[PDB]
């Protein structure tokens, strides 16, 4: 079968955050002008990454390949440009301005036509362009628009300088990669309008103008390795400039964060509404470029809300984040937190299971796909088991003891697919919280059906029983593991643990004996060293720390002859009474 169409779709299912895969499919549904298909896929991707600017760009640069028509393009801009998806990315507003350009000829239309193209440009200014510093490309195409403008009358040539000055007096206050070159064009432009009253206009901006430079400098350092390059054209979408699933450059992220923390100080002393506006812009940007970095969503969601109302906000973003990182245990919890907040309970289970399932899948995917690597297969096993412990808990807190156990059972059925943590956690809950010492102790033994030979688990299991003083159980397990544990060192530890246990609640005899077996099987062991271990207190080896480091004159005479204070301390016949009594009588 050579149907790469039904091929890639499955592939795209098993790994829906691998953007390039949708691209691969797009770069095909297109070569065969399958315009009925190209739009289904492109939309599927849209659902998951509603805020990936480039995606939307790569969607417009595909219609701009055939004149246009406000029948196909209108719906899209509606979508992505909506209020619910403030897609405030510059490389997009450009594609929108291109539209408000063609579908609005200056000539044909006239006064109100050309005046409409200003709206476009103008909005992009108030929303985006005045926040993004590397916005040279824009302002130029806009001033070039206010330049090529051929005044047709007394009011037009007037309104001409009305706008052109505004535009200048505006971008020359925002840290921009052109502040200087644009300042060289503003200073000269003001003298083609006034050589007597325009040298004062250039003497009101210098103040802010400069401050705009400096900040752009500061910005410039902080910005350092800020690699910002995502395929905007479906054609440059190489399997390299697009990030791989869950993948993100750690350093990259931090750089981004450094920017946002700078944008917080509010060095442009902007109003709150704008500051907030600004901050939001950068956050959006960030989340796009580090889309698979859970911290960026967790930081932004906990901001978009941290400010305003609408309890529905924090959840809104968090959900989008969780979409890019389905197997993310941070967004999973962050999400089942907001839900819990608005008592939307059911939503708590779903959201957490989702994570479970995606992790469950990544597992079957790594396993039946190179079980050779146990170093990355166990880690997965643990992340699964972990998100199961943190879940089992949440239900025991919200639902009741019942479900607390239902989840444990689900796990127990999953067999060795999870780690011992699950039996160790549920044993705790049942023991200290519900105080069902009997089941608590059964949960543990039960984990023996798949870990009786797991030194690590046996140790942890023991620690428990010795601490709670389960006498019998403490022993019963020991006596049935000495043979089952390989790793000599966790086995050496089993003895040490239990010898100490005898030293503590048994008898020199119980110990001596066990100490005998111990030295039999571990001849190399050091006697005095093991001796110090037997005498630990609060889990500390005070014996080595503080000693074996390299590892009324007249009555005071009677005291000098009477027996030691341990032949009678047994029961002081007389107490404080020998005070209120011997003083008077």
């Amino acid at each position: 079968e050579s149907d790469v169409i039904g091929k890639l779709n499955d592939m795209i299912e098993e790994q829906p955050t691998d953007i390039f895969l949708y691209v691969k499919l797009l770069k095909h549904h297109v070569s065969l002008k399958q315009w009925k298909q190209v739009y289904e896929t492109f939309d599927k991707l849209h659902d998951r990454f509603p805020l990936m600017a480039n995606i939307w760009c790569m969607r417009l640069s595909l219609e701009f390949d055939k004149e246009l028509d406000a029948a196909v393009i209108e719906p899209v801009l509606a979508r992505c440009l909506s209020k619910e998806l403030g897609n405030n990315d510059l490389s997009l507003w450009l594609s929108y301005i291109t539209y408000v350009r063609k579908k609005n000829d200056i000539i044909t239309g006239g006064e109100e036509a050309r005046n409409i193209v200003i709206q476009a440009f103008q909005v992009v200014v108030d929303k985006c362009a005045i926040f993004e510093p590397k916005s040279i490309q824009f302002w130029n195409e806009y001033l070039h628009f206010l330049e090529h403008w051929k005044p047709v009358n007394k009011f037009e040539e007037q309104q001409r300088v009305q706008y052109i000055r505004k535009l200048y007096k505006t971008l020359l206050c925002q840290p921009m990669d052109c502040l200087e070159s644009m300042w060289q064009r503003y200073t000269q432009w003001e003298q083609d309008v006034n050589q007597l009253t325009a040298r004062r206009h250039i003497g009101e901006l210098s103040a802010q103008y400069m401050n705009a430079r400096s900040l752009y400098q500061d910005w410039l350092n902080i910005t350092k390795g800020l690699k910002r390059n995502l395929p905007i054209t479906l054609n440059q979408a190489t399997e390299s400039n697009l990030p791989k699933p869950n993948e993100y450059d750690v350093q990259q992220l931090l750089i981004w964060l450094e920017w946002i923390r700078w944008e917080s100080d509010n060095k442009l002393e902007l109003s709150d509404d704008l500051h907030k506006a600004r901050m939001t812009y950068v956050y959006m940007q960030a989340a796009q470029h580090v889309c698979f970095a859970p911290e960026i969503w967790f930081n932004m969601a906990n901001y978009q809300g941290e400010k305003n109302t609408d309890s529905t906000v924090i959840t809104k973003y968090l959900k989008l984040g969780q979409q890019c990182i389905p197997n993310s245990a941070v967004l999973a919890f962050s999400l089942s937190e907001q839900y819990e907040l608005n008592t939307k309970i059911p939503e708590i289970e779903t959201t957490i299971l989702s994570c479970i399932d995606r992790i469950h899948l990544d597992l079957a995917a790594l396993m039946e796909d190179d079980p050779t690597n146990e170093s990355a297969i166990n880690q997965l096993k643990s992340k699964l088991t972990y998100v199961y412990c943190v879940y089992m808990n949440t239900m025991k807190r919200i639902q009741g003891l019942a479900a607390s156990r239902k989840i444990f059972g689900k796990c127990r059925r999953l067999k060795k697919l999870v780690t011992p943590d699950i039996y160790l956690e549920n044993a705790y809950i049942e023991y200290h919280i519900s105080k069902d010492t009997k089941t608590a102790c059964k949960v543990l033994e039960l984990g023996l059906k798949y870990f009786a030979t797991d030194g690590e688990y046996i140790n942890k299991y023991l620690d428990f029983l010795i601490y709670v003083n389960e006498e019998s159980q403490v022993k019963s397990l020991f006596e049935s593991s000495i043979d089952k544990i390989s790793d000599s060192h966790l086995l050496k530890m089993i003895f040490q643990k239990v010898i100490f246990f005898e030293s503590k609640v048994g008898s020199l005899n119980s110990v001596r004996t066990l100490e005998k077996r111990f030295f039999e099987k571990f001849p190399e062991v050091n006697k005095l060293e093991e001796f110090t271990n037997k005498y630990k207190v609060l889990d500390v080896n005070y014996l080595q720390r503080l000693e074996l480091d390299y590892m009324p004159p007249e009555i005071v005479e009677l005291l000098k002859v009477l027996p030691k204070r341990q032949y009678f301390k047994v029961t002081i016949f007389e107490a404080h009474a020998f005070s209120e009594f011997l003083s008077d009588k």
């Binding site: 027996p563 204070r565 032949y567 007389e574 107490a575 011997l582 003083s583």
Partner: protein
């Protein structure tokens, strides 16, 4: 702080009591009544209680030191009770 620790009493052949006696028993009625005075005044100045805590044997040396040389026996029972 540095008070006399006391003495190891060979339990296998005596009693701490048959020993308390044996020590007090070699201080003629003089010193006997002399000591008791020192324990009369020392009590009137509280700091006493401590030295009677970290040495319950000094209690018995005193309690026998009393009753012995006539001091009570119907009042003794008033101590415990």
């Amino acid at each position: 702080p540095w008070l006399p620790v006391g003495v190891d009493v060979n339990i296998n052949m005596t009693t701490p009591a048959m020993c308390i006696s044996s020590e007090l028993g070699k201080l003629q009625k003089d010193q006997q009544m002399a000591l008791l005075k020192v324990i009369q005044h020392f009590c009137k100045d509280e700091t006493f209680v401590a030295l009677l805590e970290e040495a319950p044997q000094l209690s018995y040396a005193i309690a026998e030191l009393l009753l012995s040389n006539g001091v009570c026996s119907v009042d003794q029972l008033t101590q415990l009770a």
